[PDB]
Write a protein that binds this ligand. Sequence first.
Ligand SMILES: *[C@@H]1O[C@H](CO)[C@@H](O)[C@H](O)[C@H]1NC(C)=O
Lengths: 98, 49, 49
Amino acid sequence: QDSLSSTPSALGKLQDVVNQNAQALNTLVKQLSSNFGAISSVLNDILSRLCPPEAEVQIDRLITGRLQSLQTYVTQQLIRAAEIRASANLAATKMSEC
Amino acid sequence: TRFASVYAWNRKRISNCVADYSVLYNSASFSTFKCYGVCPTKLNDLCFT
Amino acid sequence: NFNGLTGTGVLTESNKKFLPFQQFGRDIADTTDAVRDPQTLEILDITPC
Ligand SMILES: *[C@@H]1O[C@H](CO)[C@@H](O)[C@H](O)[C@H]1NC(C)=O
């Protein structure tokens, strides 16, 4: 009780999981600010300024980038999930055996 | 009535007003009407500084 | 549509302390999340529905 009450870094193993997930979500949202080669990151700006033949080209650039950003996110979550699963499997074993 | 030369082109500032571009784009008097970064048919509901 | 800025959401009076020269705010997604009403100069919060 005294050790935990006096050591800020004691629970880093749990804090790291919280931090890594928060950094992945914030990264994903920030990618919505990316132009990906388009005239603007804001989809409404494209639709309000240009008509259909030139807007579609600009939109395709945002779709390509945003789809790529989301695919990156999900792949990382699957890899991270696998690591957490192994940790949970170990914890379950310790509960049974300790 | 008179227009400036190309070497000494004239600049007129437009501000503090409402603009109707429907008289310009739909005019038959123009040989060229080329817009960059914006559609002339959508320009009629945009705002500028 | 605020001064050419189009979007959809719920509008409310804002508690954000805008300085006189400020017309709008933005979020981390580069979206607008607060605007100044071009007639009443009231600051409004924007949240989607
Ligand atoms: C609108 O008109 C009022 C006066 O009736 C004025 O106080 C206000 O500042 C005007 N708004 C703009 C953007 O000029």
